[PDB]
Amino acid sequence: KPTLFSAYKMGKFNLSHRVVLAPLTRCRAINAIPNEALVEYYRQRSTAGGFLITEGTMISPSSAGFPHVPGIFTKEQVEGWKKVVDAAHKEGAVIFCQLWHVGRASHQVYQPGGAAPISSTSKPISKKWEILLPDATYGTYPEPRPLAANEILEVVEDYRVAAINAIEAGFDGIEIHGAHGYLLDQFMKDGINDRTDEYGGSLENRCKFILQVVQAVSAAIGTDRVGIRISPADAMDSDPRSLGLAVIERLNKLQFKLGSRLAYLHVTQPRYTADGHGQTEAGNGSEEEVAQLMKTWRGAYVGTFICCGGYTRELGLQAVAQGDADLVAFGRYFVSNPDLVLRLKLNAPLNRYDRATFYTHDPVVGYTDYPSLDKGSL
Ligand SMILES: Cc1cc2nc3c(=O)[nH]c(=O)nc-3n(C[C@H](O)[C@H](O)[C@H](O)COP(=O)(O)O)c2cc1C
Numbered sequence: 090k091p092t093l094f095s096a097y098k099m100g101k102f103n104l105s106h107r108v109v110l111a112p113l114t115r116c117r118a119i120n121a122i123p124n125e126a127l128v129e130y131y132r133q134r135s136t137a138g139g140f141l142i143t144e145g146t147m148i149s150p151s152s153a154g155f156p157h158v159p160g161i162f163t164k165e166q167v168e169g170w171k172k173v174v175d176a177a178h179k180e181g182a183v184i185f186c187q188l189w190h191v192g193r194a195s196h197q198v199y200q201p202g203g204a205a206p207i208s209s210t211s212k213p214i215s216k217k218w219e220i221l222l223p224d225a226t227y228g229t230y231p232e233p234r235p236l237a238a239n240e241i242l243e244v245v246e247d248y249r250v251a252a253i254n255a256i257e258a259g260f261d262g263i264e265i266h267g268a269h270g271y272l273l274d275q276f277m278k279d280g281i282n283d284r285t286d287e288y289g290g291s292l293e294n295r296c297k298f299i300l301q302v303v304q305a306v307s308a309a310i311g312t313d314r315v316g317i318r319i320s321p322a323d324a325m326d327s328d329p330r331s332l333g334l335a336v337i338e339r340l341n342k343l344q345f346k347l348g349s350r351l352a353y354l355h356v357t358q359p360r361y362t363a364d365g366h367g368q369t370e371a372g373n374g375s376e377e378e379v380a381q382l383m384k385t386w387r388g389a390y391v392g393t394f395i396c397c398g399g400y401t402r403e404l405g406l407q408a409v410a411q412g413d414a415d416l417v418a419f420g421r422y423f424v425s426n427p428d429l430v431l432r433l434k435l436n437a438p439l440n441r442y443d444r445a446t447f448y449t450h451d452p453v454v455g456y457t458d459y460p461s462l463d464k465g466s467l
């Protein structure tokens with residue numbers, strides 16, 4: 090029976106355990122170029138046969154909504170990534186690049202020529218939320234511009250190019266960021282998508298864009314090198330269950346048509362504890378609803394399932410042992426615990442993470458200077 094520390098065949102790739110580095114935007118890729126800081130950060134977190142997913146990576150100049158996040162749409166960026174990927178591979182890691190377009194979750198300061206961010210809609214994220222600016226202040230999300238159909242195809246092409254570039258850099262594959270209210274989610278979620286054309290209305294129409302992206306990148310680099318991340322549960326849908334199942338149905342159908350499986354489906358879940366980790370005491374209620382959603386979605390998807398969001402050591406063990414997921418990703422714990430895999434294997438204490446340096450730009454401080462367990466001198 091599978092455990093969290095058991096080997097796994099993720100289609101093309103042999104993994105030695107089920108602990109995954111979740112994608113984590115950290116803003117250390119100064120002027121969008123992966124650098125020596127990123128090399129050491131991913132190297133520190135690499136294990137033999139361990140799966141790593143990079144921070145969200147720009148597919149185009151309009152795809153940014155954070156400062157000093159890496160791109161993979163220029164040769165200079167590809168060359169920077171090669172150094173990261175080579176180091177991870179030297180440690181025996183398998184590593185995927187997350188392809189990220191933020192859509193309306195941006196600001197004029199992030200956009201070429203100060204243009205409006207692009208989206209499904211003209212409606213902005215409400216003033217309830219604010220955006221981190223390059224000068225360490227917080228700003229207001231602006232009104233986005235709704236894409237025309239031909240422009241949506243231009244973005245699909247940007248994903249295709251980014252995937253090709255990822256493989257050129259040596260990445261084992263890519264993950265489509267279709268979660269957390271960013272561009273593709275702005276089309277999926279009926280709370281955001283108020284379009285009246287062929288990209289709006291039906292679940293079929295709302296899933297069109299993300300399916301076109303999956304189709305294009307699969308054609309470019311192979312189904313077995315493509316993972317997809319979603320989060321159906323200011324980005325809400327009136328029926329998260331049906332939305333998740335709608336995406337899953339279309340992925341299953343595409344796999345059956347093309348004759349092979351995608352690398353995986355990756356789904357995040359919300360939590361209801363004070364610190365966002367773990368389970369509430371035996372008898373919230375929204376937690377059981379969400380728990381059931383995750384099992385329903387996994388059950389419906391034909392292939393590898395990665396769960397993420399508030400997983401503890403115990404909940405990760407249970408998810409794999411009970412068959413709820415094949416792989417378990419960890420985000421915040423991996424910020425502060427470079428050797429998180431070893432710490433989980435030993436049930437060792439976990440370093441506290443410092444949220445104040447999640448998105449600062451120092452190559453060392455709060456980035457590569459969290460300690461591993463003392464290995465001593467053999
Ligand atoms: C600082 C930070 C950066 C993140 N960056 C990304 C990202 O670039 N792409 C993404 O899909 N999720 C991102 N996430 C969400 C995480 O991947 C993860 O789903 C979330 O932190 C919940 O998992 P956890 O409880 O293990 O932290 C980020 C989260 C944090 C805290």
Ligand SMILES: Oc1ccc2c(O)cccc2c1
Binds near residue numbers: 114145268269
């Ligand atoms: O707390 C979060 C959750 C998701 C995120 C994402 O999808 C991209 C960048 C930063 C993020 C921060």
